[PDB]
């Protein structure tokens, strides 16, 4: 069952809409969905004030597909803590897309702001454009971050992707800036493009794979040699990779960084 949200003009003061999720839409009529509360800065407003609503209701969230038929560049927390069903955004989203989600799937056809999939527990997020900082990160002060789910970004991402990661998987098909996998404990990060610096900084566990060039790396890592045609958590990666263990600035560190031999000769000692 498809429920269509057609955005009216997005406001300059952003909207916060954590109630845009199949779990809230389940069991509500089209008229009840228009009355769902969202924030517009320091005022509470109705979903209907900023979106046209149409389609067919459904009683269970697993049978709901929300289609946002337009750009929602100034709408935060879409799909926050969703457990089932699907959201497709035919445009951009602001921060916190799918933050804390437990299941289901979110597809963003455009770009996403920072904290996409922050604290993710399960399900899937797919961003066809670029993402901001803190893809699949933890919250300020907490030492327990993302514990499951898959995040795929087809474009580029910025800093601290997988910050304090404790499970799940992050795939960046483009490039990243600095500190991917900062304080990582567990999980898998695959960067198909390049890294500027500090991959795996202060990591204690988990695996980071860089298929492109790492411009700079870290002296706290131990070089283990080359591995070929590697397989990590079911992902088959053909070719040769320089293998490093660290970050030994951390006590008892067991993290692994794989970097493609072809463009990382300057990183190997």
261 forms part of the interface with other proteins (CB under 8 A)? yes
Q: How far apart are CA 5 and CA 131, in angstroms?
A: 23
Q: Choose from Ca ion, other proteins, none: what does 138 bind? Cβ within 5-8 Å by kind.
A: Ca ion
Q: Which is nearer to other proteins, 133 or 202 (CB)?
A: 133
Kindly state whether residue 240 participates in binding other proteins, applying the rule CB under 8 A: yes
Q: Print burial letters for 55-81: b (CB count within 10 Å at least 16), e (below 16).
A: bebbeebeebbbbbebbbbbbbbbbbe
Instruction: Rule CB under 8 A: say whether 141 interacts with other proteins.
Output: no
Enumerate binding residues for Ca ion (CB under 5 A). Answer: 138, 142, 164
Cβ of residue 52: shortest distance to Ca ion, in angstroms?
Answer: 39
Say if CB 246 and CB 255 are below 8 A apart.
yes
d(CA 106, CA 168): 16
Shortest distance in whole angstroms from residue 104 CB to other proteins: 26
Report the site for other proteins in 57-96 (rule: CB under 8 A).
none
- Residues 115, 132 contacting (CB under 8 angstroms): yes
Q: Is 228 in the site for other proteins (CB under 8 A)?
A: yes
Order of strands, sheet of 75-76, starting from the edge strand that comes earlier in the sequence: 43-46, 37-40, 15-16, 75-76
Out of other proteins, Ca ion, none, what residue 134 binds, judged by CB under 5 to 8 A for its kind, is other proteins
- Asked if 111 touches other proteins (CB under 8 A), the answer is no
123 or 181: CB nearest other proteins:
181
CA distance 95 to 115: 6
Of residues 133, 175, 202, 247, which one binds other proteins by CB under 8 A? 133
DSSP, collapsed to helix, strand or coil, labels residue 72 as strand
Compare residues 134 and 217 and give the one whose CB is closer to other proteins.
134
Per CB under 8 A, 14 contacts other proteins: no
Spacing of C-alpha 260 from chain mean position: 24
Which position among 13, 60, 226, 249 is part of the footprint of other proteins (CB under 8 A)? 226
CB closer to other proteins out of 102 and 173: 173
Calpha distance 42→16 (Å, rounded): 10
Q: Are 253 and 246 in contact (CB under 8 A)?
A: yes
The partner in contact with residue 158, picked from Ca ion, other proteins, none with C-beta cut-offs of 5 to 8 angstroms by kind, is other proteins
């Amino acid at each position: 069952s498809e429920i269509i949200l057609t955005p009216k003009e997005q406001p300059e003061v952003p909207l916060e809409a954590p109630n845009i999720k199949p779990d809230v839409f389940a069991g509500k009529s089209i008229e009840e969905i228009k009355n769902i509360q969202i924030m517009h800065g320091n005022e509470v407003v109705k979903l209907g004030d900023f979106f046209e609503v149409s389609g067919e209701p459904a009683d269970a969230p697993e049978d709901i597909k929300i289609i946002i038929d337009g750009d929602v560049y100034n709408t935060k927390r879409i799909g926050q803590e969703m457990t089932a069903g699907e959201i497709i955004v035919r445009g951009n989203v602001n921060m916190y897309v799918g933050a804390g989600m437990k299941g289901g799937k979110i597809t963003v056809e455009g770009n996403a702001g920072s904290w996409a999939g922050q604290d993710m527990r399960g399900g899937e997020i797919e961003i066809l454009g670029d993402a901001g900082d803190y893809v699949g990160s933890s919250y300020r002060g907490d030492w327990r971050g993302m514990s499951g789910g898959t995040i795929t970004v087809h474009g580029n991402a910025d800093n601290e992707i997988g910050e304090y990661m404790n499970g799940g998987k992050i795939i960046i098909k483009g490039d990243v800036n600095i500190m991917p996998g900062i304080h990582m404990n567990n999980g898998l990060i695959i960067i198909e493009g390049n890294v500027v610096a500090r991959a795996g900084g202060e990591m204690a566990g988990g695996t980071i794979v860089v298929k492109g060039m790492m411009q700079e790396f870290l002296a706290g890592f131990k070089y283990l040699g080359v591995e070929k045609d590697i397989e990590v958590d079911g992902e088959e990666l053909p070719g040769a990779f320089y293998k490093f263990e660290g970050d030994h600035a951390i006590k008892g560190a067991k993290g692994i960084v794989y970097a493609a031999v072809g463009c990382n000769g300057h990183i190997a000692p």
